[PDB]
Amino acid sequence: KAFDLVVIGAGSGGLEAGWNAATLYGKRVAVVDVQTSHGPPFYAALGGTCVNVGCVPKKLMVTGAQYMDHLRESAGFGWEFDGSSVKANWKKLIAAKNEAVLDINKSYEGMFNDTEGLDFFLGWGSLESKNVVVVRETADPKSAVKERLQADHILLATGSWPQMPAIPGIEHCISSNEAFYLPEPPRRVLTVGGGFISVEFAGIFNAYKPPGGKVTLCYRNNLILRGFDETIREEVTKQLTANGIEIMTNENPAKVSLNTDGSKHVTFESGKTLDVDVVMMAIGRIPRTNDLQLGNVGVKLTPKGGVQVDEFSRTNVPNIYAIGDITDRLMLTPVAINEGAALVDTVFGNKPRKTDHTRVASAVFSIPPIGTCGLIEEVAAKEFEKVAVYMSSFTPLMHNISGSKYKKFVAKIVTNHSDGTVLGVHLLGDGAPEIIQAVGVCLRLNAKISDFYNTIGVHPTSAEELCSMRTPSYYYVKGEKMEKLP
Amino acid sequence: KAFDLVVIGAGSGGLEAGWNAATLYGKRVAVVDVQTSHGPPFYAALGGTCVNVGCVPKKLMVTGAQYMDHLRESAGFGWEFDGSSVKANWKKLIAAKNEAVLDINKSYEGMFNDTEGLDFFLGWGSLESKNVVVVRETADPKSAVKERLQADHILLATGSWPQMPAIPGIEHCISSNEAFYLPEPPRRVLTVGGGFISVEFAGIFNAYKPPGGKVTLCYRNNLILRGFDETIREEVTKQLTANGIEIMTNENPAKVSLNTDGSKHVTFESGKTLDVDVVMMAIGRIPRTNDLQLGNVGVKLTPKGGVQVDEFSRTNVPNIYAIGDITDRLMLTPVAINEGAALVDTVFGNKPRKTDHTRVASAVFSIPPIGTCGLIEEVAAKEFEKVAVYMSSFTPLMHNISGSKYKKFVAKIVTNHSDGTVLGVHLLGDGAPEIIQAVGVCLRLNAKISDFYNTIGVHPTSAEELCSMRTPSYYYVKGEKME
Ligand SMILES: Cc1cc2nc3c(=O)[nH]c(=O)nc-3n(C[C@H](O)[C@H](O)[C@H](O)COP(=O)(O)OP(=O)(O)OC[C@H]3O[C@@H](n4cnc5c(N)ncnc54)[C@H](O)[C@@H]3O)c2cc1C
Ligand SMILES: Cc1cc2nc3c(=O)[nH]c(=O)nc-3n(C[C@H](O)[C@H](O)[C@H](O)COP(=O)(O)OP(=O)(O)OC[C@H]3O[C@@H](n4cnc5c(N)ncnc54)[C@H](O)[C@@H]3O)c2cc1C
Ligand SMILES: [Br-]
Ligand SMILES: [Mg+2]
Ligand SMILES: [Mg+2]
């Protein structure tokens, strides 16, 4: 019952910290989670949000969704088949996803049992005192104690949870959690929100919808995917539209009621109405701090609800650290992992290291997908006196043959024009998530635009566009966009 | 007619040099090629080998071939359709490819019309003298003169040509050139060679073959794709085999005759026989120097027939340069382009620059494909005292669901273990050619393994494997492999 490190949350960040502390530094580690395998009632489980109801299953379902486009696009290359026979069997997809996630859950179980001084505790972790974690049977602080864990160090890694807007009939709506377990693909679905989760699920539902189906995505402001490159936000909007998805911008649900046939009657703030079979709320995720009883040891939270941390993931309380989504910064699995690895290298390895939250490669598995690393130009333009934007945007030859002429591949490089330093790279198109990873390494190396254009292309690829851009398309000078420099 | 530059060969390297000299340096430029659009009789044409009978059409046809796998793989993700209705229509593929290539041909025609100081001449270019290119009706040097072009500077950029072994019945075989024009997909095809062209065409023919068809690839040596990472050579062999291609290693045709039905009867050196509809020779490509009459000016060739060049693409004759496949080095379109641009900057810009032929990213559009940049470990091990190999090799989760469980993604990083400098990166699997491009940029920046592993992954991707390898799988110490 005594440990060097107790981790509350067996997710992306918590398991990296846990495994590393045990296997690299022979430390004695307890990891707490509420559930050993995916799905209801608690959705996240051993492996965390990404494994159970996040990156892993989402990516398999987007891959499944992509076959709608491959089956159509095949015709341009001479593939012939009975188009009237094509069905998308959602139940098969969900059964395959469930088996894949369960196998990972079982993999993590094997990892704990195989590893000396790495112990999993089932139940709800909360802070009793500075050096004691209590595992209770439920999220109720008044529920039975399963365990009292003595901790030289405590890591909070409980991640996040979907935010459900407090509107009349929210109980008729789902989150991404339930989306992963729908018994039937909805004929009509409203995805609410403009972020990656709404966009990715709109794609998934669009491919698996039964005949006469309709996917509608609503967003409360003007243009989806705030924080992404603007050119790409506009293009993804057009390319989703081109594939049958209705993008309702400047619209937001005011209430939902059940129709007598069990469908949902959505009334928007605008007075507009829409009937759908499923309303999936994807308007935000919020850190899971409530259940940890942070009032008990005085761990400070932010004006947004995330655990306050310094660059070393340290809270205001010595021996207590927080990584990943609970910190409410970049909600990405590899960031959580990086932070956990750095924390353990610092505290147990005597090799202090701070996660770099700049120049983080990331993706949206939209159809087609986004890959991005570093600053968008509007952000660069406020930091740097002179910013250059290099842009290539055209439909690749193969999509002129596929018949998907709307699939413009977008490649943008944003530089500090004073020294050529690449500040950001923004891609839209097939392969963009794969292309961007080694761009992340390029930015860590402070690559300049001349490092890209002096590198020999791989031909033919989309990626070689990044090595073909010599001349800025336009600039920002003291924040002002202009075609040409003074 | 008088030019600052005459380019013989309107291909990858020739058009880059001609266009750069004309537009960046305001030079008067002539460019010669034997055909204005793709296909028989000369196959290459305005735009070069890559445009007409190479990278561009082959990539379209591999993309077409990939649908065989997509259609089958869709089932695991719940897609249903009538499998018995599926037909691969090769005629539609060839038509779509032909339109794509002709549109490029036409666009280059328009580039010459609209670029003042850049003039296209149709016919066969050869050297009359060290400042005169003669353009003739045919490759025969006795054929009619169409033009005589006075040149301050002459660029040889005629590319390469398929090598055909001198075996009995060679006339019953084709090369990649003719493969692009087969009116019907062969039921039985033997691709001869272990290089990328043989492997890429084996995958194309495997997808479009009619019912009950069979693709066989034969190679003289023990393991296809010499020059590539050895793990990847072994895995691509298994993955082709798993998709129904018969890999015949240690086998080479001795002769070909016609069966009474017009099919080809192949006899291998081993005595073994194989009946096929097409025999596609892809055993090599040789520099196209015969027709240039270089004996008129005394340009030095290698015994192979490549044009000898220094690092600045200069021949032994002042004012005569050679770039691209004619130099018989790295036969890649982007390298030819890089050499052309570096030559014109040097000669016309006085901006001295030579092409780095090291750490060139390249691809094989095998199914699944290869992306590679830099040294394989056996080469590194000879040049460096300690070499580390970081290796990740596993069937991605999506291929456990798709049912293609044979599709192992391989990611290998080779380092100078003394300082961690990345020497090579070798990938096999879906996306590899796209992943490897920015890896070329990393190697130009002398990236170390720590620069890869300290970069935060994009998840989930195949590419994040590159940023997840902290610990060598094994080493070479003074050339010897150590576990
Ligand atoms: C739909 C969706 C798609 C996503 N796609 C991607 C993507 O493609 N790429 C990407 O990088 N990121 C993606 N993310 C984000 C990614 O899932 C997170 O950033 C990551 O999982 C956060 O890791 P973490 O360690 O902070 O916590 P998590 O991985 O969320 O782990 C938290 C764990 O803590 C447990 N827990 C919580 N409270 C308690 C308690 N009191 N006691 C015990 N256990 C508790 C939970 O059961 C959970 O298992 C996605 C997220 C979602 C929801
Ligand atoms: C099947 C195949 C697939 C390939 N795939 C790829 C790939 O995916 N990626 C890649 O980078 N490379 C690829 N390559 C290689 C690429 O095609 C070559 O490296 C590149 O085209 C060579 O450029 P170049 O300038 O040397 O000559 P080329 O582009 O071959 O151009 C030479 C030109 O000279 C003309 N010519 C020849 N003799 C004369 C003469 N006497 N007078 C006038 N004109 C003449 C020809 O008609 C031709 O158009 C492939 C090659 C083949 C055959
Ligand atoms: Br061999
Ligand atoms: Mg254990
Ligand atoms: Mg002209």
Q: With CA atoms as reference, report the closest residue to B155 among B315, B308, B278.
A: B315
Known binding-site positions of B for FAD: 59, 125, 158-160, 325
Give the orientation angle of helix B196-208 with respect to helix B55-74, to 10 degrees: 50
Residue A316 to residues A43, A139, A225, Cα–Cα distance (Å): 30, 24, 34
Given ligand 2 and candidates B15, B38, B49, B119, which is best to mutate, with the most ligand atoms within 8 Å of its CB?
B49
Interface of B with A in 57-116 (CB under 8 A): 59-60, 63-64, 67, 70-71, 73-74, 76-82, 85-93, 96, 100
Cross-strand bridge partners of residue A322? A156
Q: With CA atoms as reference, report the closest residue to A32 among A121, A115, A95.
A: A121
> Has A159 been labeled as part of a binding site?
yes
Where helices occur in A295-385 by DSSP H, the ranges are 333-347, 377-383
CA B360 to mean position of chain CA atoms: 13
CB-nearest to B455 from A67, A87, A440 is A440
Separation CA A218–CA A193 (nearest Å): 6
Residue B352, both tokens: 């001295």
CA A469 to mean position of chain CA atoms: 30
The alpha-carbon gap from A301 to the nearest alpha carbon of chain B, in Å, equals: 26
Pairing of strands A188-192, B188-192: unpaired
Q: Please name the method used to determine this structure.
A: X-ray
Instruction: Give φ, ψ of B428 to 5 degrees.
Output: -130, 130
Give the number of the ligand closest to the Cα of residue B120: 5
Give me the total of CB pairs closer than 8 Å, taking one residue from chain A and one from chain B: 259
Q: Give the residue whose CA is nearest to atom 2 of ligand 1.
A: A54
Q: Does B204 touch chain A (CB under 8 A)?
A: no
Which of A89, A437, A442 to mutate to probe the B interface, most B CBs <10 Å?
Answer: A437
Pairing of strands B160-162, B285-287: antiparallel
Nearest residue of chain A to residue B55 (CA atoms): A460
Query: Residues B296, B127: contact at Cβ < 8 Å?
Result: yes
A405: number of Cβ within 10 Å: 11
Interface of B with A in 247-286 (CB under 8 A): none
Separation CA B345–CA B16 (nearest Å): 11
CA B14 to mean position of chain CA atoms: 17
The count of residues in chain A is: 486
Query: Residues A121, A149: contact at Cβ < 8 Å?
Result: yes
Residue B57, both tokens: 């059409």
SS3 of A8-50: the string is ECCCHHHHHHHHHHHHHHCCCEEEEECCCCCECCCECCCCHHH
Q: CA-based angle B430:B431:B434, to the nearest 5?
A: 160
Q: With CA atoms as reference, report the closest residue to A275 among A267, A283, A265.
A: A265
Query: Residues A322, A160: contact at Cβ < 8 Å?
Result: no
Separation CA B239–CA B218 (nearest Å): 16
Query: Residues A232, A370: contact at Cβ < 8 Å?
Result: yes
> Has A59 been labeled as part of a binding site?
yes
CA A201 – ligand 3 centroid, Å:
48
Separation CA B411–CA B396 (nearest Å): 12
This PDB structure is determined at a resolution in Å of 1.6
Separation CA A305–CA A300 (nearest Å): 9
SS3 of A67-112: the string is HHHHHHHHHHHCEECCHHHCEECHHHHHHHHHHHHHHHHHHHHHHH
| Ligand 1: lining residues by beta carbon, under 6 Å | A 8-14, 32-34, 42, 44-45, 48-50, 54-55, 58, 124-125, 157-159, 176, 197, 288, 291-292, 324-326, 331-334, 336; B 459
Q: Is B426 noted as a catalytic residue in this protein?
A: no
Taking the alpha carbons of B89, B94, B97, B98 in that order, is the dihedral positive or negative? negative
Separation CA B205–CA B273 (nearest Å): 20
- CB distance A437–B437 less than 8 Å? no
The alpha-carbon gap from A464 to the nearest alpha carbon of chain B, in Å, equals: 6
**In this structure, which amino acid lies at residue A256?**
V
Query: Residues B215, B304: contact at Cβ < 8 Å?
Result: no
- CB distance A457–B334 less than 8 Å? yes
Peptide bond before residue B460 is cis, with ω within 30 degrees of 0:
yes
Q: Does A418 touch chain B (CB under 8 A)?
A: no
Q: For A446, which DSSP code? A: T
